[PDB]
Amino acid sequence: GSSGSSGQKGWFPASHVKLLGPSSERATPAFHPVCQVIAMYDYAANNEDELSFSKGQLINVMNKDDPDWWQGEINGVTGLFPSNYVKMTTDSSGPSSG
Question: What is the CATH number for 54?
Answer without folding.
Answer: 2.30.30.40
